[PDB]
A paper describes a structure:
The 15 αβ polypeptides bind a total of 45 BChls (30 on the periplasmic side and 15 on the cytoplasmic side) and 30 Crt molecules (16 γ-carotenes and 14 OH-γ-carotene glucoside esters). Of the latter, 15 γ-carotenes are embedded in the TM region between each αβ polypeptide, whereas one locates between the Cyt-TM and the neighboring α polypeptide, and 14 OH-γ-carotene glucoside esters are positioned between two adjacent αβ polypeptides with one OH-γ-carotene glucoside ester missing in the 15th αβ polypeptide; the 16th chimeric pair does not contain BChls or Crts. The Rfl. castenholzii Crts could be divided into two groups, A and B, based on their biochemistry, orientation, and position in the LH complex. Group A Crts are deeply embedded in the TM region between the α- and β-polypeptides and have all their β-rings pointing toward the cytoplasmic side, a position similar to those in most other LH1 complexes; a comparison of the Crt conformations in Rfl. castenholzii and the purple bacterium Thermochromatium (Tch.) tepidum is shown in Figure 4B. In contrast to group A Crts, group B Crts are positioned between two adjacent αβ heterodimers (instead of inside the αβ heterodimer as in group A Crts), which is similar to that of group B Crts from Rba. sphaeroides and Rba. capsulatus. The Rfl. castenholzii group B Crts were identified as OH-γ-carotene glucoside ester esterified with C14 saturated fatty acids, with the β-ring facing the cytoplasmic side and the glucopyranosyl group facing the periplasmic side of the membrane. Collectively, the group B OH-γ-carotene glucoside esters combined with the group A γ-carotenes fill the space between the adjacent αβ heterodimers resulting in a blockage of the pores observed in the LH1 complexes of phototrophs containing only group A Crts. The tightly sealed LH “fence” of Rfl. castenholzii is thus likely unpenetrable, and as a result, alternative strategies are needed to facilitate quinone transport.
Author numbering:
A (entry chain Y): 1 to 32
B (entry chain C): 161 to 267
C (entry chain Z): 3 to 12
D (entry chain H), I (entry chain J), K (entry chain D), M (entry chain N), N (entry chain P), P (entry chain R), ...: 3 to 41
E (entry chain L): 30 to 315
F (entry chain h): 12 to 58
G (entry chain K), L (entry chain O), O (entry chain Q), Q (entry chain S): 6 to 55
H (entry chain M): 335 to 640
Write the structure that this text describes.
């Protein structure tokens, strides 16, 4: 295992979580 | 068969540098099993741990099968697929299953 | 008369 | 009014009859008690 | 207030030209029009090219090169793991690679076309987010994990009943797959999604054609559970749960072959923590 | 013989055909109901 | 409507439904005759009850 | 003639408790509603409570007995403790020792009673207000699979050990063992139908939620008043899905799709599980006879070995 | 008013007949009782 | 009216029935009495 | 108004009797003490 | 509206569907003739009932 | 008022004929009774 | 008016012809009866 | 509009649809000729019925 | 009014030609019949 | 608009679509000539029908 | 005004103290350094 | 009127670029040339 | 004015950047230059 490519791909898998987090944050901010 | 290497059994096997105090079944290998389980060596092989399609058998026997099968795959450093095609467990299409039958008879 | 739900209420 | 409608009776009876017929055919023909459609 | 509108006026009212992504990048959309009921734009052509080529490559690899007309007995399989990350036109697994690339192009084009159609109607971007979750699931199954592991032969085969053999063998290689924490979270979210869908469908159907007010369903859902969520809250919960179910199960399948080899040996730390190790007797030790 | 057993048709193929045909027909009828003329708010005044 | 139908079946049939019904019953009669013939021929070939 | 205030603020057995409602702020900000309570506590609701807590008490006390009445071992081992049905040597008998199957029998009987009484609660509280009874029949469809798992499949097989144990890990073990015992469950056609409907339910839930939130600027989530006259939000949702797929739905029949897709899952699963042991004792061999298994003569097994 | 439409009767009967005919032809074909479509 | 008769009746009856069933189950599983023994 | 309803008591007692009959039959006939329906 | 349709079938057709109906029935007749010829040739080649 | 339209009849009959033709060709090919497309 | 439009007929006929051509070419190439594309 | 169409087919065709129809039918006839020639050549090469 | 537009016809024909060219080039390359682009 | 389109094709074409159509048909003829030459060269190299 | 309330700080402090006391007691009991509760 | 110069420029440029990338990738993958070879 | 100079500048700049990144990645991960490991 290269451990450098694997961590880049893990970073991509984690970045895939971002739009849902942004949706929750937008809902929270826009409803005071 | 000769494809496995032709290795022999000597004193360093079963001992690994110790005269007495040998410990089969140490606490390290009992991670997910009850700490009193032992290999069922009073049965007959092949046929002692077969469960597929049997209507005189239920989940108790399947659990007793699974304990032994996890022991076998922990003592090899491998997964369930060293010896099976996981789409049909009765299948004998891997040679390690025959080797395992011979090694169950030996033990 | 004709309603989104398939009803025809006066 | 009447307790039940004619249409409901027809639907229930027809479906029950069809399902019972198929079930009885499956149970009887798959028992091996009768020599039917055999090579 | 309200009157009968034949739905031709509602469709013709909302058709506008040029508010898409390509219209903002190039200043114009080359294919900005409608064919039948469908909106063709850019990314509506790329997607259709990918769809046609993927279907053709799949059927050629199945019917030919395997000689079977039985659709449920094909094995559209990748190259072996001894080939590495190399592609060779003269070796088995070439029509699997072509089909995989075409399908990727089709799915990404579908996502971008959804973004375009959202932009035309002045909506939010929830549908592209929800679809991009499962598109990323496909990408991690067929691109990221094979690259990290080190071969194209780590992807699953595209046969109808035979991709279930890959699932079975991969799940029993990393035994026990039930003991994967992200697997459990994903299963929990799938079951919760089905329960919530049934609850919402029942709730809306139970009040449809009745001379009642819009506050009866709140009293119904407060008499039974002590708590009623609301009208936008239930649809938000639906969206969030649906997306998260697959977002969490990406991690389990990625970490199965790269950082972990055994999901029974993962839980070996639990009994060794100082708070409760060394407190039992025989067969209750550890 | 190249043919499946009768259970193959009973449990596998008839349900698949039923599912596909039911999906097609349900889609046809739901789209027929959705795109008809009923009470709507006028798009010109509402927007 | 309700013109060519007989007096007995007026509360059940239309002018067009009556014609379609006649077509359907003729189809069923023809199919029944053919089915009887086919069953007799296949029994002569190979009886399936033994 | 239904008085909602009386329905929510009545006293006695046929009435509510937690009468002064609470309020949670983060639920108000995220979900849009934060009031908690009051909750109805009438008949059919005390019976469920009492029988459920009887079964739960039995299970937890047996956990404690197994551990040895040691709280620290109890906390350490809580997620792999269970009570199991009587083993295969017993058949469907009830003369089983308490630490070998009697506790499971008692707890399961009480659980059956509680779920039936909860169905009755849903039905009667739906009729008491002005709404129809659609949640009760969905729960009935869900309970069909529950009673197949816990009562009828063991009855047809002939032993109690065909049923799951009561534990966090025991359900996973039951799933694994039941798939292993009867061939391979991937080649069960009604398991394929169940998975079809489950994944369709998740897809449809995500689609409906996303498209209602995306059009919520024009109050499209008020689906009660949108079934009398449809405004800009519903029109935009219809146009979106028509320009994407070529066909769309209403603000009425989409929830029909939801109900039936969620309902078919449990029915297909119950049929498949019941057939699993009693008619087809091996699903891979059956699939071979039914021509749905691929040949695979030369596997590349270097993928499946470390 | 009549309990059932003519259209419903036609649809139900035609669909049931077609399904039954296909099922019986495929059940008889794979039994091996008759020398039909045999290599 | 603080205490309601209907609640007391329902609770007492249900508690008695549950206790009777539990005691029968425990005594049957104990094996001390012959009862339904083979 | 009415402290007790006849209909509710009828429903509850009937259901309890049916459940008890089913349970007692199961427990008695699955124990092997009586020679009932022996092959 | 329906001038070419015979009086018997007026409640079921208008003259823009009578023509398409005639086309369809002619197609079906031609197909049936070809099918009979094909079946006779195939039986003369190898009988499928033995 | 006629029960069925001409368009629906045409669509249903045409689709049924095409599907039956494809299915019968597939079955007769896979049977192995006729020479046809043998290597 | 009339049952079908001209454009729907054109679309259906062209799509069906293209699909059938591709299917028949694939089946005949896979059968192996002809010496068509061989190394 | 509906003036180049023959009187029989007026309720079904336009002028533009009539022209496009003529093009399509001529295409079909040419393709059928080519298909017949191709089939004769392929049979002369290797017959597919034995 | 004409059935089809000229733009739609150009787009559809161009798409079909490109797809067929790519498909035929990829099939012929890997068929192995021609000594073209061989390592 | 259509003042240099021939009288026969007036209902179908425009003034600019006529010129674009001419360009497209010339492209197709040139491509067909090139394709015929390429096929003849490839057959002379290695025949694919044996 | 105030950043924190008295109620919140009291709740947090009491919870933290109880949890820490239990944790330290458990660690010291399982360490085995002291005799304490021995058999 | 339905044909504009800018849209055709966009389409032709995109098609040419994609074709060039595809042909480069296929020729590199074939292995027939000693190009970027270890 | 059909073409805006700003749009062409932006499009060409982005295309050049993307092509530079792609060519770097393709050349570096090959048998030759071997990620500069040598
Ligand atoms: C299903 C495919 C086609 C279609 C295929 C045909 C074909 C083919 C024919 C017709 C014919 C007719 N069709 Mg049509 N027809 C269709 C749709 C329609 C619709 C509609 C609005 O949908 C209507 C109202 C009709 C109605 C009609 C009549 C105008 C016409 C004469 C009726 C008839 O045959 O009497 C008698 C009714 C019968 C059912 C005859 C009985 C024969 C049946 C088939 C039994 C078969 C067994 C054996 C061969 C014969 C045994 C004889 C029996 C003992 C009586 N068709 C669809 C679109 N139709 C016929 C025609 O125009 O010739 C004058 C004709 O040949
Ligand atoms: C890919 C399709 C292209 C297109 C490519 C061509 C080509 C190429 C030609 C035309 C031609 C025409 N096209 Mg154009 N055309 C297109 C779209 C359109 C549209 C539209 C609104 O979409 C319209 C109204 C037209 C209109 C027209 C007419 C102006 C013109 C005359 C047809 C004709 O010659 O009749 C007769 C119609 C026939 C179909 C006869 C053809 C015979 C068939 C095709 C036989 C197959 C050929 C075979 C090799 C020959 C041997 C077979 C047998 C041995 C005989 N085209 C699309 C964009 N078009 C023709 C032209 O301009 O003439 C100078 C012409 O050559
Ligand atoms: C003989 C061998 C088997 C046996 C095998 C079967 C099979 C197989 C069947 C029965 C059915 C019956 N058997 Mg038995 N049965 C046996 C022994 C018994 C014993 C016993 C104590 O031994 C009893 C009480 C019964 C009792 C029964 C009844 C429940 C039922 C007949 C009455 C009825 O409702 O059908 C009368 C039927 C009707 C009233 C329906 C009318 C049918 C209509 C006309 C449809 C006809 C189909 C036609 C082709 C459609 C053409 C339509 C076109 C448009 C032309 N069976 C033995 C063990 N039995 C049948 C059943 O239907 O179960 C409900 C059934 O199929
Ligand atoms: C090794 C594992 C095996 C496997 C072995 C089995 C077995 C065995 C079964 C399934 C079943 C299912 N499998 Mg499987 N399955 C496999 C792999 C998969 C994969 C995959 C991607 O690999 C998928 C998607 C699935 C999917 C599924 C589901 C479709 C289905 C169960 C859904 C359901 O309705 O449960 C929801 C559960 C219920 C509706 C019943 C329980 C809920 C009730 C209502 C509880 C309410 C009362 C409760 C006590 C309330 C008290 C709580 C209080 C609030 C405190 N399986 C492989 C092949 N699978 C089940 C099935 O039915 O299919 C035939 C089943 O029995
Ligand atoms: C034994 C194996 C034989 C062989 C024997 C046969 C036989 C026998 C036949 C063919 C036929 C064909 N074969 Mg051959 N064939 C062989 C090998 C090949 C190879 C190859 C590289 O090996 C290829 C490229 C082909 C190619 C062809 C095509 C030229 C032709 C099928 C045309 C078609 O699909 O019509 C289907 C397409 C349509 C129905 C639609 C397309 C027509 C219109 C004009 C499309 C343009 C309209 C445009 C899209 C706009 C539409 C308007 C609206 C907007 C929709 N053959 C070998 C050696 N082949 C057939 C033929 O002759 O046809 C003429 C035929 O009969
Ligand atoms: C995120 C939670 C869930 C979810 C939601 C989700 N899916 C979605 C959407 C959303 C919000 C859409 O808006 C979208 C949609 O409906 O658009 C029309 C869609 C969609 N999700 C779909 C399917 C789908 N989603 C699934 C699951 C899920 N989707 C989740 C569990 C699954 C599975 C296996 O669980 C599948 C099958 C489609 C109905 C649609 C996407 C349509 C699309 O992408 O079109 C492009 C391509 C085609 C229409 C044809 C492709 C042909 C191929 C190129 C050839 C074959 C190659 C292929 C790789 C072979 C595969 C064979 C298999 C047997 C392995
Ligand atoms: C084991 C597998 C079994 C599979 C079986 C699948 C079942 C298929 C049957 C589908 C239902 C067909 C319905 C036909 C009749 C509907 C008529 C209609 O149009 O119904 C409308 C609504 O239907 C609508 O949403 C359309 C119908 C409801 C919406 C869809 C409901 C089904 C949801 C999923 C269930 C299965 C479908 C998918 C299966 C994979 C309402 O209109 P009305 O105001 O009443 O009209 C009055 C008059 O104009 C004459 O009707
Ligand atoms: C997994 C398997 C592969 C995927 C297959 C995907 C294909 C199809 C799936 C289902 C598609 C149909 C969806 C609903 C049907 C469309 C509805 C409709 O009817 O829409 C039509 C639009 O289709 C039109 O033009 C025509 C639109 C184009 C249709 C053809 C697209 C084919 C795509 C390629 C398929 C693969 C080919 C591979 C070759 C081997 C036009 O209708 P109108 O008469 O104008 O309507 C009347 C008015 O109310 C609106 O105008
Ligand atoms: C690599 C790609 C990384 C993308 C990170 C985006 C972070 C910001 C997102 C956001 O949240 O952007 C905020 C905007 C708008 O906000 P709103 O609609 O909530 O406003 C509401 C106004 N009423 O939503 C979006 O753009 C949606 C974009 C959807 C993209 C989902 C798929 C992309 C990620 C998954 C990868 C799938 C394959 C991609 C190609 C390989
Ligand atoms: C595995 C089958 C073994 C092989 C191979 C050898 N020995 Fe062993 N031996 C084995 C066990 C399980 C034990 C008992 C362990 C214990 O704790 O008592 C032994 C014991 C011995 C002893 C006695 C040790 C003692 O009494 O302290 C001796 C002297 C001994 N074994 C010698 C020995 C030699 C020389 C071997 C090679 C020829 C050999 N053993 C192999 C298991 C196994
Ligand atoms: C967008 C990602 C495209 C695929 C990325 C992989 C680059 C291919 O590059 C691969 C290397 O990754 C590999 O180490 C050796 C042999 O395994 O052969 C090279 O061609
Ligand atoms: C309502 C539930 C149906 C009751 C079914 C009863 C099945 C009885 O079956 C019993 C077995 O369970 C028992 O083990 C042996 C003992 O010899 O005798 C049988 O009769
Ligand atoms: Ca252990
Ligand atoms: Mn909703």
């Amino acid at each position: 295992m290269n451990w450098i490519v694997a961590t880049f791909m893990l970073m991509f898998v984690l970045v895939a979580f971002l739009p849902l987090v942004v949706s929750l944050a937008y809902t929270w901010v826009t409803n005071p | 068969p000769a494809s496995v290497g032709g290795y022999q059994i000597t004193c360093a096997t079963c001992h690994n540098g110790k005269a007495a105090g040998l410990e089969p079944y140490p606490i390290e290998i009992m991670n997910t099993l009850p700490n009193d389980w032992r290999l069922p060596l009073e049965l007959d092989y092949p046929g002692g741990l077969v469960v597929t399609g049997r209507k005189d058998v239920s989940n108790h026997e399947v659990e007793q099968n699974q304990f032994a099968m996890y022991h076998m795959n922990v003592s090899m450093g491998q997964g369930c697929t060293f010896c099976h095609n996981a789409r049909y467990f009765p299948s004998y299409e891997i040679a390690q299953k025959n080797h395992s039958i011979i090694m169950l008879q030996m033990t | 008369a004709a309603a989104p739900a398939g009803a025809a209420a006066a | 009014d009447r307790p039940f409608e004619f249409r409901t009776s027809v639907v229930v009876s027809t479906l029950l009859g069809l399902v019972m017929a198929l079930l009885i055919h499956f149970v009887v023909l798959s028992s091996g008690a009768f020599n039917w459609l055999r090579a | 207030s309200a009157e009968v509108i034949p739905f031709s006026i509602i469709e013709e009212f909302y058709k506008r030209p040029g508010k898409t992504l390509a219209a903002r990048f190039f200043g114009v959309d080359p294919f900005d029009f409608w064919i039948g009921r469908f909106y063709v734009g850019l990314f509506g052509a790329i997607s259709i090219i990918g769809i046609i080529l993927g279907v053709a490559f799949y059927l050629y690899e199945g019917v030919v090169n395997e000689g079977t007309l039985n659709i449920l007995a094909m094995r559209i399989e990748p190259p072996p793991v001894s080939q590495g990350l190399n592609v060779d036109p003269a070796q088995p697994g070439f029509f699997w690679f072509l089909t995989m690339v075409a399908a990727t192009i089709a799915f990404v084009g579908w996502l971008l076309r959804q973004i375009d159609i959202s932009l035309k109607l002045d909506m939010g971007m929830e549908v592209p987010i929800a679809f991009g979750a499962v598109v990323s699931s496909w990408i991690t199954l067929q691109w990221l994990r094979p690259i990290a592991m080190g071969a194209w032969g780590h992807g699953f085969p595209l046969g109808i009943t035979h991709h279930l053999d890959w699932v079975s063998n991969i799940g029993y290689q990393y035994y026990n797959f039930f003991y994967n924490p992200f697997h459990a979270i994903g299963i929990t979210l799938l079951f919760a999604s089905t329960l919530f869908l049934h609850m919402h469908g029942s709730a809306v159907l139970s009040e449809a054609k009745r001379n009642i007010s819009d506050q009866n369903i709140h009293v119904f859902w407060r008499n039974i559970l002590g708590y009623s969520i609301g009208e936008i809250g239930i649809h938000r919960v639906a969206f969030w749960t649906g997306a998260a179910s697959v977002l969490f199960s990406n991690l389990c399948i990625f970490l199965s072959g790269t950082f972990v080899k055994d999901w029974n040996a993962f839980w070996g730390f639990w009994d060794k923590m100082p708070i409760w190790n060394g407190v039992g007797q025989g067969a209750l030790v550890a | 013989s190249p043919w499946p057993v009768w259970s193959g048709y009973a449990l596998c193929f008839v349900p698949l055909a039923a599912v596909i045909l039911g999906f097609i027909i349900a889609a046809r009828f739901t789209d027929k109901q959705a795109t008809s003329a009923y009470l709507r708010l006028d798009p010109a005044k509402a927007n | 409507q309700n013109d060519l139908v007989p007096d007995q079946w007026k509360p059940l049939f239309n002018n067009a439904e009556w014609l379609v019904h006649d077509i359907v019953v003729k189809t069923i009669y023809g199919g029944l005759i053919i089915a009887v013939i086919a069953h007799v021929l296949c029994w002569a070939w190979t009886p399936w009850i033994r | 003639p239904i008085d909602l205030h009386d329905e929510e603020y009545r006293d006695g057995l046929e009435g509510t408790i937690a009468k002064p409602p609470g309020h949670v702020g983060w639920m108000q900000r995220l979900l849009g509603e934060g009031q908690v309570g009051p909750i109805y506590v009438g008949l059919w609701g005390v019976i469920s409570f009492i029988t459920f807590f009887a079964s739960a008490f039995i299970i937890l006390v047996d956990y404690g007995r197994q551990v040895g009445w040691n709280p620290i071992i109890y906390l350490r081992e809580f997620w792999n403790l269970a009570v199991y049905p009587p083993p295969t040597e017993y058949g469907l008998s009830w003369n089983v020792p308490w630490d070998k199957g009697g506790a499971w029998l008692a707890a399961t009987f009480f659980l059956h009673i509680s779920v039936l009484t909860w169905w009755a609660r849903l039905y009667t509280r739906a009729k008491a207000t002005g709404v129809g009874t659609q949640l009760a029949w969905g729960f009935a469809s869900a309970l069909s699979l529950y009673f197949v798992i816990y009562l009828f499949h063991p009855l047809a097989l002939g032993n109690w050990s065909a049923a799951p144990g009561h534990g966090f890990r025991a359900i996973l073990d039951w799933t694994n063992y039941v798939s292993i015992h009867w061939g391979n469950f991937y080649y069960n056609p009604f398991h394929m139908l169940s998975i079809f409907f489950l994944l369709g339910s998740t897809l449809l839930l995500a689609m409906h939620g996303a498209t209602i939130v995306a059009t919520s600027k024009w109050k499209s989530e008020m689906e009660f008043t949108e079934m009398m006259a449809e405004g800009p939000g519903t029109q935009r949702a219809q146009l979106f899905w028509r320009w994407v797929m070529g066909w769309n739905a209403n603000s009425y029949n989409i929830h029909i799709w939801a109900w039936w897709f969620a309902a078919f899952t449990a029915i297909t699963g119950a049929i498949g599980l019941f057939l699993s042991g009693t008619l087809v004792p091996d699903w891979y061999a059956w699939g071979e006879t039914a021509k749905i298994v691929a040949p695979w003569p030369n596997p590349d097994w270097a993928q499946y070995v470390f």
